[PDB]
Every structure is written in structure tokens, then in C-alpha cells.
Amino acid sequence: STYADYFSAWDKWEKQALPGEERDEAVSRLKECLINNSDELRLDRLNLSSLPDNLPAQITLLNVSYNQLTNLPELPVTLKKLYSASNKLSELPVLPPALESLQVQHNELENLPALPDSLLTMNISYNEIVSLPSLPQALKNLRATRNFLTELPAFNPVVREYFFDRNQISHIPESILNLRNECSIHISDNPLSSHALPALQRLTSSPDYHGPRIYFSMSD
């Protein structure tokens, strides 16, 4: 993509702004990013209902959080960090092959696309997701609070944190019990069996307990 191609598409895109929509500011930022050949582009809090199709191809970080987006365009193949939290996305495009961070919390997602093996961190909290695709083994931080998952996924001592608070999980599987002290699993506010709380209360506070750190209620 050439210089006139970019300025062209961005300039036309800016023309169709609603009142209150900061596409002017967005284009300034787009132009700044291309001129300086920058790795980062931040278009957060610009009241945007969409993005122009052609983002700068060299970017490694894209932040479009806090807008009113409904869809994201195809993403730069080079992208390592995508923040698009607090929008209205109903689905995500295919993810850049080497993405390392995915922050899409507070959207309207129902499904996730395939997750790159490079993924290290993801927050998908406050969406309407019901199942998870296969998880990257490299993944160390997954926040998924307030979705509608009906079960937990199946998982050297690296620090690992899984947040599944406020889902629809009803079964604590034996696979949790085989994780070790380095994994933390947050599981409060799920429709688990009446018995799960006191049962996990006595299990985890025991003198001889080995197994993941489990947070399983609201201090109850």
C-alpha cells in the first residue's frame, strides 16, 4: 500500500463521521503513525463507529479500545498486541499469526476465532462466549470473567492465572486438582454444587494441600 492509497482511504473515511465522532483526530493519528513509521497506533476514545479498511501495515500495537466499533478490519499481519476492549464487536477477524496480546473485554462476542500459538495474554471478559477454542500452550494469563462458559478448559512451574468468575460452570473437574501451586484459578460465582464451597474450603486450607490456588467464592 502506497502513501496516496492510505491518505485517500483515510480522507474519504473521515468524511462520513456522525456528529460527535472524532474521525478528524483519528486521521491525524493515522497520518502521524505512517510519516514516523511508528510501531504503535492508538485510536482509543475517539467515539468511532468504525475504522478505515487499510490500517498502517507496519504496526505492531493497535489500540482501539473505548469506541463504538462493531467490526474490526483485517489486521496487520505484523500485529503483536491488539487492544479493542469496550466496543460492540460481535466477532473478531482472523487473528494476526503472531499475536501476543488480545484485549477484547466488554464487547458482544459470541465466539472466538483460532488463537495463535504465540498468545501469552488474553482478556475476553464481559462478552457472551459459551465455549473456548483450543488454548495456546504459551498462554499464561486468561481473563474470562462474566461470559457464559459451561465448563472449564483442560490444563516447568510458570505463573499461570485463569479468571473464570461469573460464568455458568457447574462442575469442578479432576483436572483442576492436578495443577500445582503456580496456577491460580478464579472460580467464584458459578452455579457449582451446593457442596463445592465447603468442600473446597476444607481441601485448600488443609495443612498438606498441594494443587492450584483456587479462589472460589466472594469471601463466603
Cα 160 to Cα 185: distance, rounded to the nearest angstrom: 8
Listed by start position, the domains of the chain span 1-220
Q: Write the CB contacts of 65 (distance below 8 Å, at least 6 apart in sequence).
A: 44, 45, 83, 84, 85, 86, 87, 103
User: Where does residue 15 fall: left (phi above 0), alpha (psi -120 to 50 degrees), or beta otherwise?
Assistant: alpha
Nearest to 24 by CA among 36, 5, 11, 41: 11
Residue 12 burial (CB < 10 Å; 0-12/13-18/19+)? exposed
Nearest to 101 by CA among 180, 40, 187, 164: 40
Residue 138 burial (CB < 10 Å; 0-12/13-18/19+)? middle
Cα separation values, 30 from 41, 65, 67, 127, Å: 7, 15, 16, 29
| CB atoms inside a 10 Å sphere around CB 133 | 11
Q: Which CATH superfamily is domain 1-220 in?
A: Ribonuclease Inhibitor (3.80.10.10)
Cα 28 to Cα 119: distance, rounded to the nearest angstrom: 31
SS3 letters across the chain:
CCHHHHHHHHHHHHHCCCCCCCHHHHHHHHHHHHHCCCCEEECCCCCCCCCCCCCCCCCCEEECCCCCCCCCCCCCCCCCEEECCCCCCCCCCCCCCCCCEEECCCCCCCCCCCCCCCCCEEECCCCCCCCCCCCCCCCCEEECCCCCCCCCCCCCCCCEEEECCCCCCCCCCCCHHHCCCCEEEECCCCCCCCCHHHHHHHHHCCCCCCCCEEECCCCC
Decide: 165 and 187 in contact? Cβ < 8 Å: yes
Look-up of cell digits 478505515: 52
Cα 101 to Cα 83: distance, rounded to the nearest angstrom: 8
**Alpha-carbon torsion (118, 124, 127, 128), positive or negative:** positive
Cα separation values, 96 from 59, 93, 124, 150, Å: 11, 9, 17, 28
Nearest to 18 by CA among 63, 68, 64: 68
Look-up of cell digits 456528529: 19
**Alpha-carbon torsion (171, 153, 215, 148), positive or negative:** negative
Quote the cell numbers at residue 19.
456528529
Report the relative pairing of strands 213-215 and 183-186 from DSSP bridges: parallel
Provide long-range contacts, Cβ within 8 A and 24+ apart, for 42-49.
43/67, 44/83, 46/21, 46/22, 47/20, 47/21, 47/22, 48/21, 48/22, 48/23, 49/18, 49/21
Decide: 151 and 171 in contact? Cβ < 8 Å: yes
What is the stated resolution of the deposited model, in angstroms? 2.0
Method: X-ray
Quote the cell numbers at residue 66.
473505548
Q: Write the CB contacts of 117 (distance below 8 Å, at least 6 apart in sequence).
A: 136, 137, 138
